[PDB]
Amino acid sequence: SKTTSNAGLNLIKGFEGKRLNAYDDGVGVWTIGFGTIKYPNGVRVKKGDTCTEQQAETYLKNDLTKFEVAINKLVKVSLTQNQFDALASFTYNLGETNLANSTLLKKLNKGDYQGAADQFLVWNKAGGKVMKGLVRRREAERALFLK
Amino acid sequence: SKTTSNAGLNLIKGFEGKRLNAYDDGVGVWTIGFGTIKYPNGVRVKKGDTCTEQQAETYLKNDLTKFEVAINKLVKVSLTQNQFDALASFTYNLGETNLANSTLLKKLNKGDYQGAADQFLVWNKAGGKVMKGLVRRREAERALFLK
């Protein structure tokens, strides 16, 4: 069973940004590193927390584990490491339920890799508006999937 | 018995957006207007459909009826219109079963309005992922509920 490799980690790190001081993510949930809100020991991130780059990467790798488990359970065809990494970014962003219900996964499990790759681009909306950042993200994920 | 007023309608329009051309939501469900997937005559939205803003408003008001019915059946205490509208947004987003089983409804039906208001905030997850947009929705619903 696969885990997220450096291609997927770099993708996600680019999207989350690097923040070594805890920050309000905009809705009052304190966050640090590359999108971490809870340390692997269960302690919640709080205002005033600081971390190192290595700690942030470890925390990201931990945050990914549940979504990696979901991908390994849900996908029933072979994946290149690039394809797994693209799905890890997609699923980290959108959650396991969106992956489980997606047309992407339906087509993927039929062996239709090209159709699945094109489904990444459908998920470009937040609040019904197409977001340029989500377009760029889905395009990067599709590009890695097809690499 | 109550129906959703302009306040709840604006809350829901906020996070559904407005799209007068039908679009795929990523799970193969074509969607139009303010999150409508089935017209009031039971006909499913399909690719190529278009509607006017007025039609979209009518369709959204129709979509809300099942959730309004659920709230009026499940809630056993008085509600201001603001509180009803907050619950309409919450239940539109999360569904009748989640409302029925919620600590939110349990506290509300004991007459514990402040406890219920605070329970809005725990419903900020999708597919194992805390979502900033969901936190925003829940905080807006709580604020309207408390107004």
Author numbering:
A (entry chain B), B (entry chain A): 22 to 168
Text lifted from the article:
As a proof-of-concept, five peptidoglycan hydrolases from the Acinetobacter baumannii proteome (PHAb7-PHAb11) were identified using PlyF307 lysin-derived peptide as a template. To understand the catalytic mechanism and thermal stability of these peptidoglycan hydrolases, we attempted to decipher their structures and eventually obtained the crystal structures of PHAb8, PHAb10, and PHAb11 by X-ray crystallography. Despite their lower amino acid sequence similarity, PHAb8, PHAb10, and PHAb11 superimposed well with T4 lysozyme, especially in their Glu-Asp-Thr catalytic triad regions, suggesting that PHAb8, PHAb10, and PHAb11 may be phage-originated.
Results showed that PHAb8 was a monomer, while PHAb10 and PHAb11 formed an asymmetric dimer. Specifically, the two asymmetric units of PHAb10 formed an antiparallel dimer with a rotation angle of 177.2° along the rotation axis and a distance of 10.5 Å between them. Further, PHAb10 dimer adopted a circularly permuted architecture, in which the N-terminus of one chain and the C-terminus of another chain formed a cavity, which might be the binding site of the peptidoglycan substrate. We carefully examined the topology of the PHAb10 dimer and found that it was supported by seven pairs of intermolecular H-bonds, with three pairs supporting the head, each two pairs in midbody and tail of the PHAb10 dimer. Specifically, in the top view of chain A, Arg20 and Gly27 were involved in intermolecular H-bond interactions, supporting the head region, Gly128 and Gly129-mediated interaction contributed to the stability of midbody, while Lys133 and Arg137 were involved in intermolecular H-bond forces anchoring the tails of the PHAb10 dimer. While the variants R20IG27D, which has mutations in the head-supporting site, and G27DR137I, which has mutations in both the head and tail supporting sites, lost dimerization ability. As a result, both variants lost most of their bactericidal activity after treatment at 100°C for 1 hr, which could be further explained by the failure to recover their native forms after heat treatment.
